Amino acid sequence: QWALEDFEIGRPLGKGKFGNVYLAREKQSKFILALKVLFKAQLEKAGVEHQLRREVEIQSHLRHPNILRLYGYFHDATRVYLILEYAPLGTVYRELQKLSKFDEQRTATYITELANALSYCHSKRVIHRDIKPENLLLGSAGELKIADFGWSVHAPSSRRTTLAGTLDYLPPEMIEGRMHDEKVDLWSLGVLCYEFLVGKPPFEANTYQETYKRISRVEFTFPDFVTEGARDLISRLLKHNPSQRPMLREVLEHPWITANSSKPS
Numbered sequence: 024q025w026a027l028e029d030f031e032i033g034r035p036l037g038k039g040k041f042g043n044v045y046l047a048r049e050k051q052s053k054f055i056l057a058l059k060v061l062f063k064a065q066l067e068k069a070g071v072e073h074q075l076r077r078e079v080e081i082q083s084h085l086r087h088p089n090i091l092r093l094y095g096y097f098h099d100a101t102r103v104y105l106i107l108e109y110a111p112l113g114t115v116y117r118e119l120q121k122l123s124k125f126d127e128q129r130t131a132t133y134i135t136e137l138a139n140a141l142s143y144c145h146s147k148r149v150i151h152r153d154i155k156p157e158n159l160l161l162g163s164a165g166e167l168k169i170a171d172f173g174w175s176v177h178a179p180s181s182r183r184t185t186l187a188g189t190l191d192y193l194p195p196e197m198i199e200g201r202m203h204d205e206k207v208d209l210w211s212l213g214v215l216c217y218e219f220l221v222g223k224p225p226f227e228a229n230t231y232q233e234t235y236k237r238i239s240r241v242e243f244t245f246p247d248f249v250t251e252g253a254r255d256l257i258s259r260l261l262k263h264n265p266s267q268r269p270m271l272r273e274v275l276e277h278p279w280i281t282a283n284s285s286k287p288s
């Protein structure tokens with residue numbers, strides 16, 4: 024169906040491990056979109072074709088306003104091209120580097136938008152497993168959108184792929200290679216809530232080996248400026264035991280969320 028020839032390419036939007044993402048406009052319709060470019064050689068040397076297919080499968084079929092759309096794909100012997108919804112206000116990552124810390128209202132609104140999208144996902148037993156600021160994008164009204172379903176699967180699951188980069192958002196069961204479920208995304212939600220308020224993730228460390236130690240032991244402390252209600256939500260989400268983590272509904276109905284979020288469930 025589609026091919027490269029159908030598109031005028033524009034400025035580089037961002038870069039990932041395999042992904043190189045470009046602004047693009049579709050010649051006949053003038054539709055603006057984002058083109059994610061993957062190199063087949065890199066994909067094969069890493070053996071992550073199954074991830075690519077899972078990404079295309081899962082994300083093309085989901086439909087939620089806080090989830091980034093995927094319209095289609097094509098290839099051309101060197102590369103694979105995913106055709107995505109363009110997010111005009113960039114990443115949450117970028118926004119956090121601009122402001123250093125988010126206030127409480129900004130944080131709770133992001134958490135609500137996140138919890139809504141994740142609840143939709145979990146209702147299909149889809150778990151994302153790679154929730155972090157580089158993979159959260161912003162729509163034209165500033166609304167949060169989850170993206171990059173490269174690592175998503177159906178629960179329950181084990182991990183058959185090597186953990187490549189940062190450990191900062193992964194729960195103890197994932198880094199210890201154990202079996203896991205939905206509750207992994209709840210842990211990541213706690214990590215995110217903390218990093219939104221403090222400006223760095225709660226188990227951050229200088230080396231891999233040490234980050235690993237801080238996560239399996241759940242060693243984190245709060246700065247003075249973190250309020251009691253934020254502390255309560257975060258302490259509930261960062262439980263070593265998955266079953267002790269709240270349901271998403273309890274996150275959306277938590278007093279601190281309801282008092283600070285400007286969007287509803």
Ligand SMILES: Nc1ncnc2c1ncn2[C@@H]1O[C@H](COP(=O)(O)OP(=O)(O)O)[C@@H](O)[C@H]1O
Pocket residue numbers: 036037038039040041042043044057059091107108109110111113114157158160170171173
């Ligand atoms: N739809 C999009 N709109 C705007 N920027 C994007 C979009 N998709 C990706 N980007 C930018 O490119 C980066 C890499 O995209 P991603 O899909 O996460 O690739 P990877 O799977 O390699 O991490 C993102 O972190 C973001 O900065």
Ligand SMILES: FC(F)(F)c1cnc(N2CCCNCC2)c(Cl)c1
Pocket residue numbers: 049052054056094095106
């Ligand atoms: F170039 C793209 F990305 F493939 C593309 C082209 N036309 C599109 N539209 C027509 C179909 C219904 N949606 C409204 C616009 C879309 Cl959504 C994507």
Ligand SMILES: [Mg+2]
Pocket residue numbers: 039157158171
């Ligand atoms: Mg990514």
Ligand SMILES: [Mg+2]
Pocket residue numbers: 039042171173174
């Ligand atoms: Mg990926």
